[PDB]
């Protein structure tokens, strides 16, 4: 972002990661996770990241 005056250095320090939240015991959670895996293997996450 502007004024383009910062930078990120070094590698990551911990194992952090975001996922999709769903209620416990929900029957619809498994196709959501399958769709997440399909979007991961399809590379569309990298496309939205770029």
């Amino acid at each position: 972002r502007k004024p383009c005056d910062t930078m990120k250095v070094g590698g990551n320090l911990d194992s952090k990661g975001y996922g999709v939240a769903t209620p416990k015991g929900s029957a619809l959670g498994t196709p959501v996770n399958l769709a997440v895996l399909k979007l991961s293997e399809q590379g569309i996450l990298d496309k939205l990241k770029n």
Binding site: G10, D14, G17, Y18, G19, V36
Partner: protein, 132 residues
């Protein structure tokens, strides 16, 4: 003798670049008021499943926490536990204390703790630096 024989709210919070309002946000209605990463993510989930949704906004501005006194989860976690929402697509950190109350899918975007510096430039002048 035998047996009894028988015979979508999506919540998020305003965070950049995940959920951002449009420029002419007052000139539209419905789920098209907002844009960003998680909006496109929810549209792709609805494309790969085929169920219509509804984008809602969490009121309190809190992500999720359980007080030691009240034992009440706040924010989108309290919306999922107490049934105020149906599904949450938001950048929430998957922790140990959150898995025991609600489930999570596999993590799609990994990250870590970063270091921010001033990023110095090589602003070296001319005649002013020769008499150094």
């Amino acid at each position: 003798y035998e047996r009894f024989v028988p015979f979508i709210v999506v919540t998020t919070i305003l965070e950049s670049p995940y959920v951002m309002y449009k420029k002419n946000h007052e000139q539209l209605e419905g789920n098209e008021r907002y844009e960003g990463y998680c909006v496109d993510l929810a549209y792709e989930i609805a494309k790969h499943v085929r169920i219509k949704y509804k984008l809602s906004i969490v009121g309190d501005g809190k992500y999720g926490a359980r007080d030691p006194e009240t034992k009440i989860w706040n924010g989108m976690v309290g919306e999922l536990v107490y049934g105020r929402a149906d599904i949450a697509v938001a950048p929430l950190t998957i922790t140990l204390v959150r898995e025991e109350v609600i489930d999570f899918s596999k993590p799609f975007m990994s990250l870590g703790i970063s270091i921010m510096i001033k990023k110095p430039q090589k602003s070296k002048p001319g005649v002013f630096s020769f008499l150094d």
